[PDB]
Amino acid sequence: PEIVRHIVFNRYKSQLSQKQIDQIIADYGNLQNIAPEMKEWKWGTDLGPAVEDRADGFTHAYESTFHSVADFLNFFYSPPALEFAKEFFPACEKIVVLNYIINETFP
Template identity: 30%
Template sequence: MAKGKGEVKHIFLAQFKEGITDEEKEECIKRFQSIVPHFPSLKTFKWGEELSIANFDQGFTHVFDLTFESVEGVAQYISHPEHVAYAEFFLPKLEKFVAVDYTPK
């Protein structure tokens, strides 16, 4: 991850595998929300379902939008045991995902 100054946005797009129920999706989101307090540099956590207004979603159905105080905060989040354990639970339920980090201008 390149060094940047200021806050960093971490955007995660997810497409759940066929057969994952709405209840399982809700559990994934609740667990994601439950780990948020473990990251002091995490300023905001938002999520939502893709609306398909322009039909460019490429199958992604859920968006997770996190704002960190710094690049170092993102690095701490990625390697933190709570995040690692959550990823081990969450990622097998996904068909595909993409994550990007950027510094807002």
């Protein structure tokens, strides 16, 4: 059990301004600058019913990557990871989050 991904989708609460949504993304970002375990941070916004209409109202998507299920646990119970979770989850109107061990292989 070595490489695990953290994929979050959310929607934001309609009351929040962009300035605030921006400050929240940015904080998620430089989480890397405080948490060493956190690794391959990517975010982005669903390209709409235009392309494919199965976002069920989810708007954003965020990937974080880790070098051992052990590094993932150490992070998720650390001051910063918990600190930042109080900022972020309270701003979500929809939330869904999968950690999985990364698998390139079929069955």
